Write a protein that binds this DNA or RNA. Sequence first.
DNA 1: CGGCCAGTGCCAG
DNA 2: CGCTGGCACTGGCCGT
Lengths: 105, 686
Amino acid sequence: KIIHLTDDSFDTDVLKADGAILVDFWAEWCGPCKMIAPILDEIADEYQGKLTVAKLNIDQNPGTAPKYGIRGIPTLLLFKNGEVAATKVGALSKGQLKEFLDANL
Amino acid sequence: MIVSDIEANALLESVTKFHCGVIYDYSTAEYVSYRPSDFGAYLDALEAEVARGGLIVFHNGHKYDVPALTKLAKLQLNREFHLPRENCIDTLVLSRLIHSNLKDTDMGLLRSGKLPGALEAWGYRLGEMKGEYKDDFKRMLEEQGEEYVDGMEWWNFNEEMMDYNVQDVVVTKALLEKLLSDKHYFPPEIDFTDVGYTTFWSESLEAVDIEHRAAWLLAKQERNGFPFDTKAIEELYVELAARRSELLRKLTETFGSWYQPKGGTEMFCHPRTGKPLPKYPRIKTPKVGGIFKKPEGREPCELDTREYVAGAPYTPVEHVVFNPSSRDHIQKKLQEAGWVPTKYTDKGAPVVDDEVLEGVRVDDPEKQAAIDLIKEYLMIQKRIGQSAEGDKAWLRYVAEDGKIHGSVNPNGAVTGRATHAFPNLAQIPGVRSPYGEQCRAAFGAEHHLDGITGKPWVQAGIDASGLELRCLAHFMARFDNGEYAHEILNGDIHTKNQIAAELPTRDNAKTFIYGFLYGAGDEKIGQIVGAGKERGKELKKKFLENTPAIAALRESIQQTLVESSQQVKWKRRWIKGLDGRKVHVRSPHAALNTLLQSAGALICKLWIIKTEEMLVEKGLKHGWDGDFAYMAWVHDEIQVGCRTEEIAQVVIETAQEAMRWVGDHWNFRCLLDTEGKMGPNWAICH
DNA sequence: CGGCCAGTGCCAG
DNA sequence: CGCTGGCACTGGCCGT
Ligand SMILES: Nc1ccn([C@H]2CC[C@@H](COP(=O)(O)OP(=O)(O)OP(=O)(O)O)O2)c(=O)n1
Ligand SMILES: [Mg+2]
Ligand SMILES: [Mg+2]
Ligand SMILES: [Mg+2]
């Protein structure tokens, strides 16, 4: 259910998505990133229908994050028609993420 | 004999006011202070000591006080004042001779904490007086509410300046007597604080006379400066900067940016077990933040636009762009390209010098090609840093007179060699290295227009031929009866070695021969000749056999200094120099180098002194308002500006005569020679 | 930020 | 065990 993005598919998979897309900017060496990973795997299942969860590894895809002034990871960007609708940085818990998604969806 | 010191309003280059001075006279045993209106009287007292055939002791007076007084006397009193060289003593010059194994702050120009080893106390004090005085001044002001400006402590005379002037002299007097108490340089039977100048120079060790003459000549050289082509270097800077920018563009295309953790304070701990994970990036758990903002009793709380949420940890990161100057960056990108670092440093970092770069091999042909762009980039930086952007860049040092007045510590190296700095004119890129011609041509007599006729001057470059090998020949003459000394002058020695050693360039043969002569290992020898350790061994034995007296010389030196040895037990830890001084030996394996480098340094030192003296007694005047001007002394070479070609021809011939004179002066067992070149600049004259 | 200061390398003789 | 030197850059660390 989770979309594995790349620098070259980011534009059409996210910016032209036409729908709600939660993008997770992460890295294999970040503690918090590993923490929230399993939470996203489930958030995708549940919210399937009104939201798409996508991940972008900033090491393998170094060109996208800079355009959003990424200052910390994991960075969670909720995209809405090619425009950031909301941003939250940190390993939020299951509930917290839900609170965030319900409040912006 | 008198001991003196002055306080003026600025460094030599722009001093315009004499603030005060102090004189301690040995015959009266009293101190006398001269304030600003006493300037004329102060000068009178100095000249009086000269009329008595006496001596004047300053600490760093050769480079500062003496020239400063001449300048100030002319400006303020419109008087001609010129203390004669033979009447002056410099405790800094003496300290550097006697305590040649110690460093010093060069009168406060170098931070004391950056220097290795210990520092002589009185000299340290004298060197810190300016900064120390500035502290007092600044404190007294902020103690009075007033603000401290730029460096106002030197704008006007005041009683605290007077007191420091007095302390400098008492300290200089103490330093002097401590140095004079050195039996090796000053015979115990003579009270050197109670003799005329002729007795002082003739009764003390030869080295004392040579050091004072060298310092007096070299201070003059500094004042002369080296005519510099500012325009050509600014243009070179543009060319180099353009190339740097283009290399950066290509390299940053090849090696893209990336993120690294930065600014993390908290330790990341396993959420399950809870154990600290020090290998994971530091994190940052925020305290402020939530989904919504504090309330709203059944009416949707306003969403918190906040980017964080208290409790949820994250890893702070910075975006970093590939920097070709960073060995770390280069290391990261190349290993990521499959490079397997072979050699590392004594700290766990992979070596990233030109040898390894040239040998790196990666599969991706683009990155494989970027390795050459990196080599170029680093070299370009070396040139830019030295010529324009570095703290000691030539462009930052050009004076208003269009010259660079590089500084010289006449006896800064333990062996008796001099050191150069601000900027170091003894490390200008060679004409055969990238951009060398442009760098070298920018330093030249042609860039100085005569003050009267406006015509450019000419340059005379003279360099001692195969200096240290002739020194070797000399010292091993007692073992081979002058065999090598005779063979050495059969055609050029370095060119001959080049051929036999089958080396590419004449310069490469020099780096080889001296690397070999001074203990390079089989491997190092290989590196120098661009081969392996096997080729290193071949050349080692091949040249040792040719002249087995080398081993004999090496053995005698060892038997003279060591009795056993890690850690060494010394019989005596110094070599007696050609002029009698003690030359501190740092290590048994560098002893031969100490012996030969010292001999060559003292020969060259007496050489530049004798050359100038011979020119003077021939009628030539030293200065831009005269016939010739020393512009630089780089170990065994002098570059001299000359008003005319004829004078250049005479300087070149005179330099040769003087060299032969030095050889005869010390009964050298190898004939000494020089090679001279006339031309407009340093690219042609060396 | 700008002095300090180790590490590393390279320039010359 | 090349040795004698100066100095530029990066990157860690700390205080106006
Ligand atoms: N890599 C080097 C080059 C030089 N030197 C020393 C010994 C000689 C002295 C002066 O250097 P050069 O003038 O370059 O050497 P030279 O033997 O005088 O050669 P030339 O005859 O060409 O001047 O510096 C050294 O120790 N290591
Ligand atoms: Mg003084
Ligand atoms: Mg030479
Ligand atoms: Mg030379």
